[PDB]
Amino acid sequence: MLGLKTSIIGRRVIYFQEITSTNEFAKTSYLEEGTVIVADKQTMGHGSPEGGLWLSIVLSPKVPQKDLPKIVFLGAVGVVETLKEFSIDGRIKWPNAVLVNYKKIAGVLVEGKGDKIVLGIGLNVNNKVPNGATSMKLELGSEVPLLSVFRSLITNLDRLYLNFLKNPMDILNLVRDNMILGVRVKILGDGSFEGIAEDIDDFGRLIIRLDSGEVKKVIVSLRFL
Template identity: 50%
Template sequence: MFGLNTKIIGRRVIYFQEIDSTNEYAKRIALNEEEGTIIVADTQKSGYGRKFRTWASPRGGLWMSVILKPKTTPDHIVKIVFLGAVAVVETLERFGIDARIKWPNDVLVNEKKICGILTEGSFSEKEVYYIILGIGLNVNNPIPEELVGISTSISKVLGVRIPTEEVFKILVERLEHWYGEFLKGNDEKILQKWREKALLGRNVKIIMEDKEIGGKALDIDELGALILELEDGRREKILYGDVSLRFE
């Protein structure tokens, strides 16, 4: 899993057989750790996704976090999620899997979740101290019975087991490429690639903490907000929320 030939992502890899959470460990060491360091584990005891929802992390999956320290402002952080999703989709394409992105941070195959992406970090109003890009990708791991209808894995899609190390190396390569574009200021290139792979033009339901909104997911703006066309024709920008594709 080591010996990566990269400029930034994965110059240093910290590996655990078992850990509480790669994101939590990354946050503990981020300020004193070099940019691009990856924390990867065979299993996580306390893996989590957005809103600290439990993320099952048994052996066989790819559970990793990357420490990033871009010289940018906090309003650009969401693009780290987008470039992570694009990198995952391109990794899956190398194995002949056609994947799509559901705003803001899920990668789906046949409308079943195969990967979750989470960014956390430390920043002020004008400065980013560090960003943790967490990726949980189902490779060969079993899918919990209660999630079989909504989740899948690479091995389930292909019908064969794929070496996790091979998936890891390709993913790091694609992350290196797209993070490089981010550092060069090619934000629109990232967003356009995201659009090409995203589930847009669909009727969706946006689930927020205090309400739900239905409409058609049209696009994202330059800061990553989802542009939703409401039933009365008005358009609304959604900054936070969960998307359900099964909206009638």
């Protein structure tokens, strides 16, 4: 009854009033490629109250092993395109987040269970959000039809994915033109360091120029300074 017109993503949709995790369900259940798992709320979300868009998409891209790490970008760019349709300007915080005026509005989590890949996306729409974060509702000043957002996002993801299967390098430039670059960041963890986020390379790695001139490639906890 949803009348989705997508080719792969959205061929089937499994909706839950409540679920522990859409990613976990997608990983442990046999599902046809393109199956979308969506829930009103997730009890055990990871990286999800009522009002947000919480979903996972089952993919099985028969593409080279090296571009597998690009699936996360499909999710982020998909979100950016959807936000634009709703008059919101989202920017990608490498490698899995979308911010609006530096406030997080969405997050992406990709897991490769077995031979299938699960693309998880969490987008704040009408749900309450933690201080520092934002939502489509807070940006627009009014409640946004959640199903309208779902339809828009699924449509964009199906298009991006079909093209990815043919021209897998295309997504990188879309990410570049929509990500936060030219600013100082810090990579947390052992061997921590700071520098300018210059660009992403052909593998999707973040290229950091340290003040010494050294160039590092990040394949991760990132912080804007």
